[PDB]
Symmetry: D2
Subunit: 248 residues, 4 copies
């Protein structure tokens, strides 16, 4: 079970759904996990979920667009725990709109949170990891980064860009013993999808050879596998977790 024993992990966007299941699963494998949320109710919910699961772990408030707070989290984690072994980038918003009508700020907010923030966090964690000659960065992207989707040109750009960044990072970090990969969910059962009406939910399932939405745990198990020492020869890749919706 404890393949991540004594490792220290940061999961951004860990309050609900996918990020929560990732946080819990990394703690389950022995990792000490800081999950982040955008608000205090979220950070508290992250703590409470660890404790409900009978696991160690913390919630913290983080605006991934605030370089000062990102750098602060890296410093405090290193100070309290002496190490930073795993980064999982799961913070990410949508601001969907037809490209024709899409405003500059609707573009920017998606690019900032989903691409720029991923770069900044990755660069921040890489300094200690490169020095330690160990680490894992796992970026939670999305099938939309590989296949595109009307109304999500901003989201498609940002997530394809994270994959692009990932490959270049892997080539940059070389023999330094850090792997960088993406996990690309398809349509996962969450609050965001549970709230949409039955007709649209079925329209999603039609797209999927397995005939069901995935679970946040599907994503958590894929991330935990990549975070493991036993996945140390995998880097620069995307692990598609989409029920066969997109294949490569």
């Amino acid at each position: 079970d404890k393949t991540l024993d004594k490792q220290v992990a940061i999961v951004t966007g860990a309050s609900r759904g996918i990020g929560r299941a990732i946080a819990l699963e990394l703690a389950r494998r022995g990792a000490m996990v800081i999950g982040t949320a955008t608000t205090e109710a979220g950070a508290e919910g992250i703590g409470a979920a660890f404790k409900q699961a009978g696991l160690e772990g913390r919630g913290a408030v983080l605006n991934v667009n605030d370089a000062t707070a990102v750098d602060a989290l890296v410093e405090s984690t290193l100070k309290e725990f002496g190490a930073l072994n795993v980064l999982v980038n799961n913070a990410g918003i949508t601001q969907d709109q037809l490209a024709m009508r899409m405003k500059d700020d609707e573009w920017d907010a998606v690019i900032d949170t989903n691409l720029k923030a991923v770069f900044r966090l990755s660069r921040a964690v890489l300094r200690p990891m490169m020095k330690a000659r160990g680490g894992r960065i796992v970026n939670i992207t999305s099938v939309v980064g590989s296949a595109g989707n009307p109304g999500q040109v901003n989201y498609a750009a940002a997530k394809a860009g994270v994959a692009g960044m990932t490959r270049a990072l892997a080539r940059e970090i070389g023999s330094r013993g850090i792997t960088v990969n993406c996990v690309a969910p398809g349509f996962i059962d969450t609050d965001m999808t549970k709230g949409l009406p039955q007709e649209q939910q079925t329209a999603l399932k039609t797209q999927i050879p397995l005939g069901r939405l995935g679970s946040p745990e599907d994503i958590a198990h894929a991330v935990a596998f990549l975070a493991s020492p036993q996945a140390g020869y995998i880097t620069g890749t995307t692990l598609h977790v989409n029920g066969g919706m997109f294949m490569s």
Copy 2:
């Protein structure tokens, strides 16, 4: 010869190597081409290169990050010509540096010029193309988008981003008959590569099964083909022009 007769084309970054070959070639096929450059000399030279090859064609000054200027180019182009059929997005700069040392400004400049500007210009031309129910967007990216390259994490991100965007926009606007595609140059013989010492250039060639650097004209023909009416069933793809350096 004249597959683009009576078409009107904008080629951003048309001043040298690839952008200039693309502009000339589109002109040779009967299109009216407005080539853009960042400065006034750049613009004048684009005129003079058309002038010189015995071709209609216009240089113009454009800062692709300036929305006002971008919209004014579209508006002025519609006013004079009544149509905007082809957009070739070739405006791009590199700000190469290790991710570790990469300044925020180095990341921002590459993302804004190579990704955000591509979205803005694309969005501006969709208005006329949508209403015409026809058009071509060809985005000039780079093998670096698909494969990564040390020193160019920002460039890898942006170019992977353009492809992501291309796929989503193609899905979004395909019912109106506009195709949106990329052409990903490999290592192309330009001023930048002419600059390097033979040992550096030979190190490029070794990654290339055809054993040579490509030309501006290789890209130019690739683009001229996708721009033509005869490529109207090709959408949301990347046409790799890299001598076998990257295959997919």
Copy 3:
């Protein structure tokens, strides 16, 4: 117009739809084209199509699975024309069936015809192209190779196999200047079942044989001499990469 002036091209499976449009478009651009069919009726229809267009060009009979007949056409083409610059592998049939129900001969027929034939023909034409330090191999595959399709596990394997051979072959013979590429048709109108096909297609329409012919003619030209080991997808947005 004449970007293939004085080139000699063989197009296998050139009798109808996509093969015919390819054969004709190459002839239009100057190439001397031998189109192949499995039967004499096919061969004569290929000759007739060139003549109706006012083009030079020839029909021949070829069983692409007979290795003798394949080396023999390459040789008989060189004898008569003294050159072989372009090969288009468009021969190929389907034998659709669910994998659970699929017979070994339905798997073999598709693999032999779509994959092994492509090896044999490419190997055969490599001799003069390797010797001449130039040439174009354009393999007609299918979106099915990239995306899969239920009832088409044999066809998917064959066509995906052709892409993979292309990439390996492109790396292997690239020094000598020959390009090897694939053109992957999506759903092409040849010869509310049609509404469910269009649903999958951003452009909202089936492609034409001419869409494929123009992509092929492009890759076959000198001006595409830096493009190798790729798949040019011609599928209206049905599959993107």
Copy 4:
């Protein structure tokens, strides 16, 4: 520990390197494993490897090109264990040659073994799998399937064909809960791989060859109930050598 507890798995080509590591890893996770090799020599060794690890499992002889023997392996397996939850298609050969010199039998051999046999094996295990509405097929391919390689046009075509089959099959059998995936090793240190090594390493960002255990852990992940939403994909295990 036992993510594959009580499951039954066939691993073809299980006598050495990758296949052996996979076979043993599946057994450590609680699977009953039948590992195959062409010769009764490889079969005995497979038995011995399990004994050495103190594990359940056994070796069987199988010409993956023999239609009758393939179907009878599946039959006997269902006969003895009542179930067949996992197939790992690892059996495979190379017959490298420049395409322009390659013989028909060098093409056929690679394609029969690496592509046709993969189809046969998969078609036979789907009968029991589809009746159980559950299963895993994991195909061991290779980076050469994705990036190509001089000398290996037959190998590249076979492996790329397997990836293509996998996508079509995932679409066909997805609704019954079975996943079909590939694992694509890059350069792995085996008795086949072990300045020749130095060259290979410059191609690999991580700076080293992989191990059979790297492949086995990937395979075990995909085989697990926990990877049940992953289908039709290729999991690259290549140190950054090919990135997709």
